[PDB]
């Protein structure tokens, strides 16, 4: 068959809305980053867990970055066609459960394979593996995260595919605590069908080969990264005075 149906008017509108939503919630110049608590990088070439936890030098800055990003993701989610049709309870459940995953996805835009870092400006706003360990996280999360970023980067997603993937990630019916899974699934299916249709008629080969399957696999990968992040957040939370280095939003989402 190899049918390549055209995007429906609705699907075109959905894509346009998501692109617009992303453009309004993701500043590619990272101009607000100077408003976060300043990044501080202490000497830790040894990757000392003891020293990292005692200082957590990069936590205030990166926690502010994550908090800021969660706010943007909330804004993005609210613009996803159908998201407003869900109960506030389900909206919050989806946002809290997908927050870190969407952050990982959206961060791919600042990630660069030039030096395997998230470059958001001058050296000050260039985040490397070492900066994440300075925030209290370990390689058990960072290494696979980097691998995830590279794999995602190599898919060479169109922005349309990128925003659809984030939307699909958020509107997932298999999140613990969801009430109306059926409605959430209907919304996700509409987005998934849009993505499948877009890839089949807009993505040139050979990058289109099994692209949809590869994208869905990334969503599965995110679940694992989510779980690992939650475990590390727990440990991090055990460190005295940690709450002060976080933010109310971060504490609620991951607490
Ligand atoms: C956010 C965004 C950015 C980078 C994301 C990064 C780079 C640094 C390390 C991170 C974020 C830093 C995590 C700090 C620990 C946060 C808590 C909640 C305490 O565990 C790991 C997940 C995503 C990674 C910059 C820009 O692309 C916006 C994007 O939303």
Swiss-Prot record:
Binding-site residues, calcitriol: 26, 69, 106, 110, 137, 229
Predominant cellular place of this UniProt entry's protein: nucleus
Motif annotated as 9aaTAD, chain positions: 248-255
Record's keyword terms, sorted: Cytoplasm, Disease variant, DNA-binding, Metal-binding, Nucleus, Receptor, Transcription, Transcription regulation, Ubl conjugation, Zinc, Zinc-finger
Function: Nuclear receptor for calcitriol, the active form of vitamin D3 which mediates the action of this vitamin on cells. Enters the nucleus upon vitamin D3 binding where it forms heterodimers with the retinoid X receptor/RXR. The VDR-RXR heterodimers bind to specific response elements on DNA and activate the transcription of vitamin D3-responsive target genes. Plays a central role in calcium homeostasis. Also functions as a receptor for the secondary bile acid lithocholic acid (LCA) and its metabolites.
Entry comment, domain topic: Composed of three domains: a modulating N-terminal domain, a DNA-binding domain and a C-terminal ligand-binding domain.
Similarity section: Belongs to the nuclear hormone receptor family. NR1 subfamily.
UniProt protein name: Vitamin D3 receptor
Organism for this UniProt entry: Homo sapiens (Human)
Gene from which this protein is expressed: VDR
């Amino acid at each position: 068959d190899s049918l390549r149906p055209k995007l429906s008017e609705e699907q075109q509108r959905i894509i346009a809305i998501l692109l617009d939503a992303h453009h309004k919630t993701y500043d590619p110049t990272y101009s607000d980053f100077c408003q976060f608590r300043p990044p501080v990088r202490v000497n830790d070439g040894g990757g000392s867990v003891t020293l990292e936890l005692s200082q957590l030098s990069m936590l205030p800055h990166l926690a502010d970055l994550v908090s800021y990003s969660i706010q943007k993701v909330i804004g993005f989610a609210k613009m996803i066609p159908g998201f407003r049709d869900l109960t506030s309870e389900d909206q919050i459940v989806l946002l809290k459960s997908s927050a870190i995953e969407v952050i990982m996805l959206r961060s791919n835009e600042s990630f660069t394979m030039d030096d395997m870092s998230w470059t958001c400006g001058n050296q000050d706003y260039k985040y490397r593996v070492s900066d994440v360990t300075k925030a209290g996280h370990s390689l058990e999360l960072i290494e696979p995260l980097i691998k995830f970023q590279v794999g995602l980067k190599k898919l060479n997603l169109h922005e349309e595919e990128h925003v659809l993937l984030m939307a699909i990630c958020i509107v997932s019916p298999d999140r613990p605590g969801v009430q109306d899974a059926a409605l959430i699934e209907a919304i996700q299916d509409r987005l998934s069908n849009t993505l499948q249709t877009y890839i089949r008629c807009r993505h040139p080969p050979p990058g289109s080969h099994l692209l949809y399957a590869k994208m869905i696999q990334k969503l599965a990968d995110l679940r694992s990264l989510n779980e690992e992040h939650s475990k590390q957040y727990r440990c991090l939370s055990f460190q005295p005075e940690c709450s002060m280095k976080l933010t109310p939003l971060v504490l609620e989402v991951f607490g």
